Amino acid sequence: SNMEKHLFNLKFAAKELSRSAKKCDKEEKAEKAKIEKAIQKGNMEVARIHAENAIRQKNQAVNFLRMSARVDAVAARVQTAVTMGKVTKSMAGVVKSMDATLKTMNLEKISALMDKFEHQFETLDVQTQQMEDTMSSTTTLTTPQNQVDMLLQEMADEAGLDLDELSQRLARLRDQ
Amino acid sequence: SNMEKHLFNLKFAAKELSRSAKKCDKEEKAEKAKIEKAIQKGNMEVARIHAENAIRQKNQAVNFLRMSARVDAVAARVQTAVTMGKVTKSMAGVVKSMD
Amino acid sequence: ATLKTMNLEKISALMDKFEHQFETLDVQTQQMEDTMSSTTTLTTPQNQVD
Amino acid sequence: HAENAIRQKNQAVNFLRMSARVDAVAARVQTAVTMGKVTKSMAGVVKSMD
Amino acid sequence: FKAERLRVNLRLVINRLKLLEKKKTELAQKARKEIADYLAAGKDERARIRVEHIIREDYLVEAMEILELYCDLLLARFGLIQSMKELDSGLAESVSTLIWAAPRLQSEVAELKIVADQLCAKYSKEYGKLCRTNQIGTVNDRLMHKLSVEAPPKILVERYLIEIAKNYNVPYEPDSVVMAE
């Protein structure tokens, strides 16, 4: 917002002062060279004006550099403020959202919903067990127990690891 | 929703503070070099202003890094909250469906 | 303008609210931890993982 | 990680048991469908022969 | 009244006093150099008034430290004072000193004024715009002297000058008339 553009202007003026100090420095160099090339010809006043001009350029350069450092510090502070303000705004937003959510989805509602989830899936387990029993009862002729037992015993002996008269006697007891 | 965009803004400001700290660090390096190249010419005040500027850059950099860490932690917490909220919504949905 | 609007007292209150809200969120997470650990217990025994 | 792995193993064996059951049921239904097609064809040829 | 407002403002005053103490310390350290420089250039009375500013600022710092101590004590016993209607013997000094210093530091810190107001609107026995003026006659004497407005003794100023000249490695001829008395 306004603070952001003002910060931009501050940093702009800072780097402007910086580049102006650099400009004054190079102008100081140029004047120092001009005084060199002028004093050779025996001009004392020209050299004097060139010298004072160079000194002025140097002084103004250091002043501009000091001002630029100050403004850079101020702009950095303002940048800190702007970023912190954005963070504060976002934190307020999430605070409002969390308030709404928690008020809607409270802890009690959560607990109840989770208990309902648990009981529902327990009931689903019961359903699965019911279907297990039925499917095991139905497909029983095509999947005897003795056959699978013999296969397991044989394949265990192979892989190398250990793990009718009954009904007739029950019939005897029934007859008794 | 609003919480998601606010989280995005938080993480944006976090990485912004991070890159700003890096910028301040490189500016500190530049100022330290400028003071080196300036003290050779016998300028004491220029060196002084450059030095204090560099110290300010360093301090502001560490401050920005601390703030960035804090905001990153907060944004991570908010991300946890957002994800947990999505999970809760989905669990409620499947609860209704199963019911 | 900002400080007059967003004062220090308002900041403190808002931050305390943030803190308490996320503590409540921790409680919620713990509640869900307990439930999810209780539910998926047959498929995740303790002896086996040990 | 360990409990997650144990849960994956248990759920895998459960899914395999369920898959075997459903495969048996689907095989039974396939038997029924084929037998029904055969019955329909036999009825057709019965009508034609009649 | 609102109690949470008082609590929050107390915490804020504590933090603000901490920061201001650190800042005043830095400024004093930076101004002692200027005082030394003025001493190293003939000017003596000028540096004298400067060190007068310094000692006044340091008294302010000490007063702020004591005030922070009392504010933290009040923040601790908040639970106790929030229930009782009449203050106890332990909080009497703190409350009196704080209410007396509020208008003194109202410029540097603002929350202190709000704290004083909350305490005034909270109590009624010898409390008010006029009752407080008479019931604040039990404030800390040390802080009262530190925060007072009076020209410090010239001997103390001369000693400060002597020391500041010694540390900064510069000469200084203290007036014997002051060093004697």
Side-chain angles (χ1 to χ4, degrees), chain A residues 1-163 165-174, chain B, chain C, chain D, chain E residues 1-42 45-121 123-124 128 137 140-174 180:
Chain A
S1 70
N2 302 329
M3 197 186 303
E4 185 177 357
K5 58 183 296 305
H6 294 138
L7 170 63
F8 169 82
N9 297 14
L10 286 175
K11 302 192 81 176
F12 170 83
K15 63 179 180 58
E16 179 178 358
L17 291 178
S18 181
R19 72 181 71 269
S20 298
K22 296 174 179 176
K23 187 187 297 184
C24 297
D25 187 359
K26 60 181 291 185
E27 289 291 353
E28 177 270 10
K29 300 171 187 176
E31 293 293 338
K32 187 163 284 186
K34 288 179 179 180
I35 176 174
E36 287 173 16
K37 276 186 290 186
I39 185 173
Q40 295 175 5
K41 301 189 295 184
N43 297 335
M44 174 58 182
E45 59 182 344
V46 179
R48 190 131 194 171
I49 59 181
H50 282 155
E52 61 184 20
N53 188 330
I55 294 289
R56 183 263 298 177
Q57 287 288 5
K58 182 182 72 174
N59 292 114
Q60 191 206 352
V62 57
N63 293 332
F64 269 16
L65 207 152
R66 185 184 297 93
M67 298 169 62
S68 180
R70 287 193 302 152
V71 177
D72 277 327
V74 173
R77 201 74 179 82
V78 172
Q79 169 54 246
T80 314
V82 168
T83 302
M84 179 50 56
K86 295 185 186 303
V87 170
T88 297
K89 168 172 170 294
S90 300
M91 287 186 74
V94 301
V95 164
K96 296 172 184 177
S97 300
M98 288 297 295
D99 187 1
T101 300
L102 295 175
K103 188 177 181 62
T104 298
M105 181 63 65
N106 307 78
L107 299 178
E108 304 177 9
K109 185 174 183 178
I110 284 286
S111 182
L113 185 155
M114 292 293 162
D115 301 7
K116 191 173 182 60
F117 178 102
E118 188 176 350
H119 296 342
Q120 284 176 358
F121 279 91
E122 291 172 1
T123 293
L124 190 68
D125 184 1
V126 176
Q127 173 178 337
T128 304
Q129 183 61 14
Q130 283 287 164
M131 296 178 63
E132 186 72 30
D133 304 336
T134 299
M135 295 173 180
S136 61
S137 300
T138 300
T139 59
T140 183
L141 305 180
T142 57
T143 306
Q145 193 65 234
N146 191 327
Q147 297 184 3
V148 59
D149 293 357
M150 292 294 183
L151 171 57
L152 282 170
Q153 292 302 144
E154 294 299 339
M155 180 159 291
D157 304 12
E158 181 177 359
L161 59 90
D162 192 336
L163 302 178
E165 56 78 22
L166 177 52
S167 59
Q168 198 284 344
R169 290 171 58 183
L170 271 71
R172 298 178 189 176
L173 296 179
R174 284 186 288 274
Chain B
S1 70
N2 302 329
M3 197 186 303
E4 185 177 357
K5 58 183 296 305
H6 294 138
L7 170 63
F8 169 82
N9 297 14
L10 286 175
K11 302 192 81 176
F12 170 84
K15 63 179 180 58
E16 179 178 358
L17 291 178
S18 181
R19 72 181 71 269
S20 298
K22 296 174 179 176
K23 187 187 297 184
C24 297
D25 187 359
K26 60 181 291 185
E27 289 291 353
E28 177 270 10
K29 300 171 187 176
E31 293 293 338
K32 187 163 284 186
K34 288 179 179 180
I35 176 174
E36 287 174 16
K37 276 186 290 186
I39 185 173
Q40 295 175 4
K41 301 189 295 184
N43 297 335
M44 174 58 182
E45 59 182 344
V46 179
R48 190 131 194 171
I49 59 181
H50 282 155
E52 61 184 21
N53 188 330
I55 294 288
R56 183 263 298 178
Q57 287 288 5
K58 182 182 72 174
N59 292 114
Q60 191 206 352
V62 58
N63 293 332
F64 269 16
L65 207 152
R66 185 184 297 93
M67 298 169 62
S68 180
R70 287 193 302 152
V71 177
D72 277 327
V74 173
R77 201 74 179 82
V78 172
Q79 169 54 246
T80 314
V82 168
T83 302
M84 179 50 56
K86 295 185 186 303
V87 170
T88 297
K89 168 172 170 294
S90 300
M91 287 186 74
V94 301
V95 164
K96 296 172 184 177
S97 300
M98 288 297 295
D99 187 1
Chain C
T2 300
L3 295 175
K4 188 177 181 62
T5 298
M6 181 63 64
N7 307 78
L8 299 178
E9 304 177 9
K10 185 174 183 178
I11 284 286
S12 182
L14 185 155
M15 292 293 162
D16 301 7
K17 191 173 182 60
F18 178 102
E19 188 176 350
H20 296 342
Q21 284 176 358
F22 279 91
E23 291 172 0
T24 293
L25 190 68
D26 184 1
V27 176
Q28 173 178 337
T29 304
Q30 182 61 14
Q31 283 287 164
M32 296 178 63
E33 186 72 30
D34 304 336
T35 299
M36 295 173 180
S37 61
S38 300
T39 300
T40 58
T41 183
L42 305 180
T43 57
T44 306
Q46 193 65 234
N47 191 327
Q48 297 184 3
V49 59
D50 293 357
Chain D
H1 282 155
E3 61 184 20
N4 188 330
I6 294 288
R7 183 263 298 177
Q8 287 288 5
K9 182 182 72 174
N10 292 114
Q11 191 206 352
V13 58
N14 293 332
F15 269 16
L16 207 152
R17 185 184 297 93
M18 298 169 62
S19 180
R21 287 193 302 152
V22 177
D23 277 327
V25 173
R28 201 74 179 82
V29 172
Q30 169 54 246
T31 314
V33 168
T34 302
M35 179 50 56
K37 295 185 186 303
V38 170
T39 297
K40 168 172 170 294
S41 300
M42 287 186 74
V45 301
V46 164
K47 296 172 184 177
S48 300
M49 288 297 295
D50 187 1
Chain E
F1 66 95
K2 306 301 296 300
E4 186 63 14
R5 181 182 177 86
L6 175 62
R7 180 173 174 181
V8 175
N9 293 23
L10 288 166
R11 281 203 295 268
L12 296 173
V13 167
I14 290 169
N15 289 337
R16 185 179 295 272
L17 291 177
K18 290 179 180 179
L19 300 181
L20 188 60
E21 171 174 0
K22 190 67 178 62
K23 180 172 180 175
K24 298 273 182 177
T25 302
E26 294 291 348
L27 294 180
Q29 180 61 12
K30 177 171 178 295
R32 280 189 284 270
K33 179 182 292 183
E34 179 180 354
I35 286 176
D37 298 11
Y38 276 63
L39 284 169
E45 194 68 5
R46 192 71 168 86
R48 204 164 300 178
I49 308 310
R50 297 302 306 178
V51 61
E52 185 173 353
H53 286 102
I54 293 289
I55 179 56
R56 179 168 296 281
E57 209 72 359
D58 198 333
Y59 286 163
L60 172 59
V61 167
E62 183 63 11
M64 286 195 304
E65 181 182 5
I66 295 173
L67 183 64
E68 178 180 343
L69 178 67
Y70 296 166
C71 293
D72 192 68
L73 176 64
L74 182 64
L75 194 70
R77 299 180 180 179
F78 192 87
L80 167 57
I81 198 67
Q82 185 176 6
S83 301
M84 280 296 301
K85 304 179 183 179
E86 299 180 359
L87 59 85
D88 63 357
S89 60
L91 299 175
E93 178 181 356
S94 298
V95 172
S96 300
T97 302
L98 195 155
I99 293 172
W100 179 84
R104 304 294 187 277
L105 307 183
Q106 186 175 4
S107 60
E108 299 293 357
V109 305
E111 298 294 334
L112 191 63
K113 175 57 178 178
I114 300 175
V115 169
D117 296 2
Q118 292 293 133
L119 297 183
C120 178
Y123 304 158
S124 60
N140 186 331
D141 61 357
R142 182 177 62 177
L143 187 150
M144 180 178 177
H145 179 271
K146 295 292 183 299
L147 196 63
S148 300
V149 282
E150 296 183 358
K154 57 185 177 63
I155 58 180
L156 179 61
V157 183
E158 194 177 29
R159 282 182 282 181
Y160 288 160
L161 293 173
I162 293 165
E163 176 172 359
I164 294 171
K166 180 184 179 301
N167 293 91
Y168 281 87
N169 302 121
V170 298
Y172 173 74
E173 292 65 1

